[PDB]
Write a protein that binds this ligand. Structure first.
Ligand SMILES: Cc1ncc(COP(=O)(O)O)c(CN[C@H](C(=O)O)[C@H](C)O)c1O
Ligand SMILES: Cc1ncc(COP(=O)(O)O)c(CN[C@H](C(=O)O)[C@H](C)O)c1O
Lengths: 405, 405
């Protein structure tokens, strides 16, 4: 940076702290990642100066010849990445991507079926304090109490009982592969649209390591950050038959001007994901996740569903008589970043929880491998099995320091 | 840029075109501006890597110590700038800022009173193809057919007749000062909340050149770009009594994770606006607007309302027997960027229009002054009075080139 340090010392100082923190900590929040310098440069571009309401070649303001090229590069790359017939790369966020799909196919008060929020469903999949739960009538399907795998017969019974206009699949904390084929079969049975929110798994989808929802879902939403390793923002994929309606839902329906500099950064991230080394990266993410799961089981930890098929894992801390909140706090003390997370049929509130959620996408990006996975697991065991030992915590601190260099 | 040119030649080429276009054209779209290099650097920062759901010191994810400082700097600077009791700097856009206020005080189907969309009201103030018009029952107040000034007796009659739960004031194409005191008096008469969308005039408010809605409105929304000359995004100001409810409306109500890098850029822009030279800049914006209005009247053009009190002006092209669409197109041919804009009681559709909207915020930022205003007006007259003369258009082209260097 050149101009920010001179113009705004206060803001620069805090940014510089944050940069150093990102290097110093072991980042295990499942939704987090580190973007390339190219992605950041696109975001820090003069494209923030362009007002571009409308769509490429169909703008409502002149001067958009070049931002049109940028947006089309994003849409075409997204379509190549996911094999979708149409992309909308303007959603400001995953929340707004979801909002737009809901706005497209639902009237106020329509019934929607989504994954139980305490079994892995997202805020925007029907929380009663989110627009989704307030605007529409959400009902929920559950995972099996033993396997912690989605109970497809419960999905089907809930659909047949409640007759939703829309079924939503995908999750913020589900460590197994989702069966989109079964979701579409149920959707077809009850005459419901199927929406897949693939935010967490989108990078893995792109790399052929998770089944692609696109051929099964009427609408696929996602964030561009997370496993896809792009800028913070949303995206909607769909077949050509819904393209016009989805585009009108984004604008003029729920947004105004798009963030053209963020869309440039989306195009950049999509370009990166189309490359072979992103495929290699993504396999290391899943490989690392499986290795981490195994090493945690080796320390004596119980994992929700017994392990992982993706980038993320959930530790059920009940056997250690710990809440997720306690574990989160103590891990924070040693420089490991997790979040407390409800587990299926959690006896604790969402603010306390009986689990922690852990993902490998961030640590994999910085070059951590299987040996680092073993060591992370060993540090977690050291800390959680000795929460009252300041000496154990100091040793943990020093081992975390050795990992991040 | 260093990494983007190497990693993504296609995206870099289009960005580079856009950069050169920004320098080459005369940008007169009223909502546009050019941000500082410090603002862009903040946007291109590693803060895009941080997930920060919740609010400063009340986050739902760890590691937010430093992004908390950044957000607080934005909120405190905003509060100092506008004298507001509470700021929310997380809205992704002006659309989302508006959506959140509506979400806070309205139920589905509530009556809202806003400015007639073809008299200067915004899309999000009740368009029937926008969430606002679909979710709530919007009724409209008008400007006087002669003066083109808001008819405060019509505001009052519409409020008393329709009994709105919320009155909205502010505009995308109103060239006179808005009387917030009268809006609040009417609101108080009918027991309605008052919301002011100050997006266009926020920089002028900050500089003491437009009356401040904050002491009169329950809720003030705005964009951070436009006259405020910051990054693209939204903001809500309000008194402390509504702080908690506004914050919950943004999250968990209508968004998820905030754009911390954009919030850093907001803090930067707010820091700039607190400085004396931003005050001097803003006066030049209004000074230039008045001078431009006068010089256009000198060319024989009719202006909506007879001139301007702010950064923007509307030309009523009916006397020249031109539509706004025709004028927009021909000005585009010579390198002047305007938009077609409906005028009050426009006989044409919103897609054709009888006017063009012109603002000076962008040209003022690049250092244009009164003499440049006279020349811009002279070029506009040359072009619009000779739409069929390729020689007039070439001369216009060369004079535009002389202005932008
Ligand atoms: C499945 C899923 N979809 C959307 C989003 C949020 O998108 P945005 O933040 O851009 O509005 C999420 C967010 N998930 C968070 C995370 O996993 O850490 C958290 C649970 O909100 C999501 O999971
Ligand atoms: C008064 C007013 N409020 C909000 C916005 C849009 O905010 P965002 O684009 O970040 O969602 C606008 C936009 N106005 C545009 C412009 O003036 O050029 C256009 C009329 O939509 C606004 O005017």
């Amino acid at each position: 940076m050149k101009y920010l340090p001179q113009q705004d010392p206060q803001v620069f100082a805090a940014i510089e702290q944050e940069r150093k923190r990102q290097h110093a900590k072991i980042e295990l929040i499942a939704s987090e990642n580190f973007v390339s310098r190219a992605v950041m440069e696109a975001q820090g571009s003069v494209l923030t100066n362009k007002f571009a309401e409308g769509y490429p070649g169909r703008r409502y303001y002149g001067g958009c010849e070049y931002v049109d090229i940028v947006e089309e590069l994003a849409r075409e790359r997204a379509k190549q990445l996911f094999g979708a017939e149409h992309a909308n790369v303007q959603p400001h966020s995953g929340a707004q991507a979801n909002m737009a799909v809901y706005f497209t196919v639902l009237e106020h008060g329509d019934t929607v079926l989504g994954m139980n929020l305490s079994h892995g469903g997202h805020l925007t999949h029907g929380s009663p304090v989110n627009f989704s739960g307030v605007q529409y009538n959400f009902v929920a399907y559950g995972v099996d109490p033993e396997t912690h795998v989605i109970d497809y017969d419960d999905v089907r019974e809930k659909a047949r009982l409640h007759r939703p206009k829309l079924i939503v699949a995908a999750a913020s904390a589900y460590p197994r592969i989702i069966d989109f084929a079964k979701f579409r079969e149920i959707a077809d049975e009850v005459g419901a649209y199927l929406m897949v929110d693939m935010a967490h798994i989108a990078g893995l989808v792109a790399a052929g390591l998770h089944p692609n929802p696109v051929p099964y879902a009427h609408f696929v939403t996602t964030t561009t950050h997370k496993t896809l390793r792009g800028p913070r923002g949303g995206m909607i994929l769909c077949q050509e038959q819904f393209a016009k309606q989805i585009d009108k839902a984004i604008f003029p329906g729920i947004q105004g001007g798009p963030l053209m500099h963020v869309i440039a950064a989306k195009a950049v991230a999509f370009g990166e994901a189309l490359q072979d080394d992103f495929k290699a990266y993504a396999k290391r993410v899943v490989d690392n996740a499986k290795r981490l799961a195994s090493a945690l089981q080796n320390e004596g930890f119980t994992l929700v569903s017994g392990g992982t098929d993706n980038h993320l894992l959930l530790v059920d801390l009940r056997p250690q008589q710990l809440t997720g909140k306690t574990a989160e706090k103590v891990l924070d003390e040693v420089g490991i970043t997790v979040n407390k997370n409800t587990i299926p049929y959690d006896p604790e509130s969402p603010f306390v929880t009986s689990g922690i959620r852990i993902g490998t996408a961030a640590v994999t990006t910085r070059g951590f491998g299987l040996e680092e996975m073993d060591e992370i697991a060993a540090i977690i065991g050291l800390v959680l099995k000795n929460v009252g030992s300041e000496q154990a915590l100091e040793e943990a601190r020093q081992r975390v320091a050795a990992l991040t260099d």
